[PDB]
């Protein structure tokens, strides 16, 4: 569904 | 001022107890998803729902997901350049 998220 | 529609802005974000605060996702055109109201996100001027396109300087349309994060963990802040739209016009 999604690869490419990032949680700082 | 003029030219409404699409513009962008770049938010310097700084590096505190509870760190930056922020879920982003996406490649390339990057979106942020949310902010967190009271840290170094939301103090650095950034909305929830916005179209981070770069940075430092570096585009976000090149480098990996762990490299984006490594970049912006390399420093206890960061410049992001992000587009958004204005709310109500």
Do not use: W
């Not at chain 2, 770049?10 to 107890?17: G, R």
């Not at chain 2, 090149?62 to 963990?73: A, G, M, P, R, Y």
Request: proline share 3%.
């Amino acid at each position: 569904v999604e690869n490419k998220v990032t949680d700082l | 001022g003029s030219h409404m529609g699409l513009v962008q802005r770049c938010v310097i974000i700084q590096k505190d107890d509870n760190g930056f605060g922020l879920t982003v996702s996406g490649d390339n055109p990057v979106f942020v998803q949310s902010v967190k109201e009271d840290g170094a996100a939301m103090r650095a001027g950034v909305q929830t729902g916005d179209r981070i396109i770069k940075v430092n300087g570096t585009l976000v349309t090149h480098s990996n997901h762990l490299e984006v994060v490594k970049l912006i963990k390399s420093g206890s802040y960061v410049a992001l350049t992000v587009q958004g739209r204005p709310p109500g016009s």
